[PDB]
Structure 1
């Protein structure tokens, strides 16, 4: 299938799923009900960075579906594909906000769920110094639990942060890897839509550390492509929806490494089947250099 159509497919699927769960919100809670994420000063971080407006009640969350529909121009041009990928990310936040409104505690451990603002700032000061060389948003399903743990423990050993979302979380706990913020391994959710909580990390990094005002979308995407060094590793079969989410990571400037055969785009969407060298392709595609530690040498 044509790649542009595949992104348009999952984006339209994401909208249809967002309309479904926000319809549950208006029936169980009415059009006036508090909508917010825990310990966030930016309301809906993805929607805020794009429009500069905050979402408080369910009626505004329902009225934010118009943002998704506006970003889904179905013309086979690159700028339409990046916008369509952003539409999926906005719809993923709509679904994820609805998860927090229909249930007071929708996410239970091992799933961390949303990441609070103080965690962003805490994690922010080492990112500038290069203490963590990058972040690895590895999602999907590995063919073997050993090859999953082999990769995640490799990324952790490099000192950088890795973020699990999907079936790989189950393969990681089987692989005897240890999670935690100090461990730089964060499992988000089993649903595909829970990847949006890592997208809000880079967006909030543009608002907090980049000092960019909400609504300067082109500048936020510039900060995201240049400063925050993120890359996504997609494993296993790829549905139309998750493919649509990958275009959102391109809009942020993040390459998409995968093991599934897919119409490649250089430096942005690549296919590496050798799991043993997968870590190296990801570190190169994002220009990640490991900070060596040399003992000091004085000559006085």
Structure 2
């Protein structure tokens, strides 16, 4: 299975999970039931950026699966791969929205789940200033808790805002990593779809700071690529869904670095086994100056 086929398989799995969870939400709560994220002004940010539509009820959430379906075209060209990554991102957002409408408190501490607009505005000032020179999106599991803690604290000591997805949260807790918004170590959630909660940070950064109106998807992608200094460090074995989510990160212009053997793409998808050089490799790949 080559890179394109891996991304397409991951996007289809994300679509299947989104369809299942949306069906569950439709069964339990009804199509008139409200759909929203806590304290946001852009409804579902990824769908709002891609199309301009605001998802307000469960029926509209079910109708948002058509966006995911139309974004998956299985032809081995780079544009289709980027669109398939975006389909995975939209599907992950739909899954997170369904989680919020199904459970009153989908995320428990230390996971924070969705990040509200006021937090985005608070982080915007140090973002453009340079006190936050980048965003380290750490996903998966490191071979040890010690190495995960070392990498996370290396990013933290450099001022980067690091977000954690997956078992790396538990490894960092075992590694005595101090977490919080002021400490710049944000645990999003144990599921892969929780990575969307940092993706919407970039998307809304284009909506708030950039002033790009909803539906101008190419302008949003250009803004995230040229303004948001985010990158992905994917540790541990990578499923097709993880690779598809990484394709979404690449579609947003965010390079993906991993310790796994993957079909490398220069400046976009890079393998770095040496955990002692992963921080420097990511800073170089994202062109970050400390």
Superposed pair shares fold, TM > 0.5:
yes
Cα deviation, residue 125, structure 1: 0.8
Cα deviation, residue 174, structure 1: 0.1
1:261 aligns with 2:258: no
Query: 1:296 corresponds to which residue?
Result: none
- Paired with 2:159 and 2:111, the residues of 1 have a C-alpha distance of 22
Q: Runs of at least 4 residues of structure 1 off by over 4 A?
A: none
- Paired with 1:248 and 1:256, the residues of 2 have a C-alpha distance of 10
- Paired with 1:52 and 1:160, the residues of 2 have a C-alpha distance of 31
- Paired with 2:32 and 2:66, the residues of 1 have a C-alpha distance of 18
What's the TM-score once normalised by structure 2's chain length? 0.99
Cα deviation, residue 162, structure 1: 0.2
CA deviations 1:143-195 (Å, max 9, x no partner) are 00000000000000001110001000000000000000000000000011100
- Paired with 1:90 and 1:220, the residues of 2 have a C-alpha distance of 14
- Paired with 1:174 and 1:121, the residues of 2 have a C-alpha distance of 31
Query: 2:94 corresponds to which residue?
Result: 94
- Paired with 2:93 and 2:257, the residues of 1 have a C-alpha distance of 23
Cα deviation, residue 283, structure 1: 0.2
| 1:275 match: secondary structure | coil
Cα deviation, residue 131, structure 1: 1.0
- Paired with 1:34 and 1:124, the residues of 2 have a C-alpha distance of 29
| 1:276 match: secondary structure | coil
Cα deviation, residue 218, structure 1: 0.5
1:25 aligns with 2:25: yes
CA deviations 1:57-111 (Å, max 9, x no partner) are 0000000000000000000000000000000000000000000011011111011
- Paired with 1:197 and 1:234, the residues of 2 have a C-alpha distance of 16
CA deviations 1:244-263 (Å, max 9, x no partner) are 00000011001000000000
- Paired with 2:130 and 2:178, the residues of 1 have a C-alpha distance of 23
Query: 2:192 corresponds to which residue?
Result: 192
- Paired with 2:203 and 2:131, the residues of 1 have a C-alpha distance of 20
CA deviations 1:209-240 (Å, max 9, x no partner) are 00000000000000000001000000000001
| 1:139 match: secondary structure | strand
- The runs of 5 or more residues in structure 1 that have no matched partner are 288-298
| 1:238 match: secondary structure | coil
Please report the RMSD computed on the Cα atoms of aligned residues, expressed in angstroms. 2.5
**Residues paired across the two proteins, number:** 289
CA deviations 1:30-65 (Å, max 9, x no partner) are 111010001100000000000001000000000000
- Paired with 2:260 and 2:79, the residues of 1 have a C-alpha distance of 24
Query: 1:281 corresponds to which residue?
Result: 281
CA deviations 1:127-153 (Å, max 9, x no partner) are 111111000000000000000000000
Alignment of 1:174-189 (within 5 A): 174-189=174-189
Alignment of 1:152-191 (within 5 A): 152-191=152-191
| 2:264 match: secondary structure | coil
